[PDB]
Design a binder for this molecule. Structure first.
Ligand SMILES: NC(=O)COc1ccccc1
Ligand SMILES: [Cl-]
Ligand SMILES: [Cl-]
Ligand SMILES: [Cl-]
Ligand SMILES: [Cl-]
Ligand SMILES: [Cl-]
Ligand SMILES: [Mg+2]
Length: 348
């Protein structure tokens, strides 16, 4: 067991191993608090997150367990990994607080998409990295659900990592109105059309790729209905084949109230873009999720010929998510989480 020290950081008592120095607040909210620190063991600048009320209800205890399980699994160059997890508790009986440690991220995609002038070569390398990470995430049967520029960390050398695993499900209020939290969502999950699957993430990658090419949000809807009208004007209204797959009768009825529209010519929307980029956007932004390109198929598309290496695009170890259908008490989720804290092995 390392030695711990205590300090008060903006209203909060932090108790952390001596290896972590120069703690300074960076973020706060319902979920808890984040501090930047220097890790003397590794030489890395790190983010240390102290969870708030990790075991306060069945829903919160299960959420805590889910985040720790996901962060412990993800071992890929283009995905968030866990550097450390700790508790000052010396037994299950005194266990209350959980702290998570990862690499300190500076800029997100927004910080470079809004400001920098991006070459076609920059768009190739950024989208290649997102798809390389997604091939890994999807091989473990994990669905991200929330890919968007603020969830993509990018460094001075244009190297990218995917963020946001096991946090609180987004609220109805958070998805209302003129909000970036909805603009990247696949229509079938935005409107609850059907049981969704991993193909939702490929819609989001298409929305990100269009915005890097134009500098403009692809579907900046003022509300769910305005956003659907923007989507259908570009990709066309659904045909009989997709309408049958909308399990919701009310959603099927509303779609059929809209005048039919053909798919638009993407070379006339994305004026001047690399023809290979235009071709890839046509294969991602397909209304029927069954017909979208997969991450593994997209890596082999000619747009990425300069970066693609089928011997350096790895898949994940199997991920057992049977806990997701399990009904347990608060203390049972707390005991499972404690076992995962004490069993942690740090990266080489
Ligand atoms: N769960 C996430 O995606 C982010 O989690 C962390 C964020 C900061 C420090 C540690 C963990
Ligand atoms: Cl230490
Ligand atoms: Cl990482
Ligand atoms: Cl504790
Ligand atoms: Cl965003
Ligand atoms: Cl597993
Ligand atoms: Mg999110």
């Amino acid at each position: 067991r390392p030695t711990f020290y205590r300090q008060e950081l903006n209203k909060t008592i932090w108790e952390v191993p001596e290896r972590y120095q120069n703690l300074s607040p960076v973020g706060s909210g319902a979920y808890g608090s984040v501090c930047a620190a220097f890790d003397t063991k590794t030489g890395h600048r790190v983010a240390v997150k102290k969870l708030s009320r990790p075991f306060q209800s069945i829903i919160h205890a299960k959420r805590t367990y889910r985040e720790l399980r996901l962060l412990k699994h993800m071992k890929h160059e283009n995905v968030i990994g866990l550097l450390d997890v700790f508790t000052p508790a010396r037994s299950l009986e005194e266990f209350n607080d959980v702290y998570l440690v990862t690499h300190l991220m500076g800029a997100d995609l927004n910080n470079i998409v809004k400001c920098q002038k991006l070459t076609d070569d920059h768009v190739q390398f950024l989208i290649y990295q997102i798809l390389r990470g997604l091939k890994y995430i999807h091989s473990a049967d994990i669905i991200h659900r929330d890919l968007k520029p603020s969830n993509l960390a990018v460094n001075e050398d244009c190297e990218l990592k995917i963020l946001d695993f096991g946090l609180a499900r987004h609220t109805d209020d958070e998805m209302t109105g003129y909000v970036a939290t909805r603009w990247y969502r696949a229509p079938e999950i935005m409107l609850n059309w059907m049981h969704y699957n991993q193909t939702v993430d490929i819609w989001s990658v298409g929305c990100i790729m269009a915005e890097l090419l134009t500098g403009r949000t692809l579907f900046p809807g003022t509300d769910h209905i305005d956003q659907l009208k923007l989507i259908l004007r570009l990709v066309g209204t659904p045909g009989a084949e997709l309408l049958k797959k909308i399990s919701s009768e009310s959603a099927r009825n509303y779609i059929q109230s809209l005048a039919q529209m053909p798919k638009m010519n993407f070379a006339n929307v994305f004026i001047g873009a690399n023809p290979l980029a235009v071709d890839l956007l046509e294969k991602m932004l397909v209304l029927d999720s069954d017909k979208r390109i997969t991450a593994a198929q997209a890596l082999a598309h000619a747009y990425f010929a300069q970066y693609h290496d089928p011997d350096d695009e790895p898949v994940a170890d199997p991920y057992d998510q049977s806990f997701e259908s399990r009904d347990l008490l608060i203390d049972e989720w707390k005991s499972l989480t404690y076992d995962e804290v004490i069993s942690f092995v740090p990266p080489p």
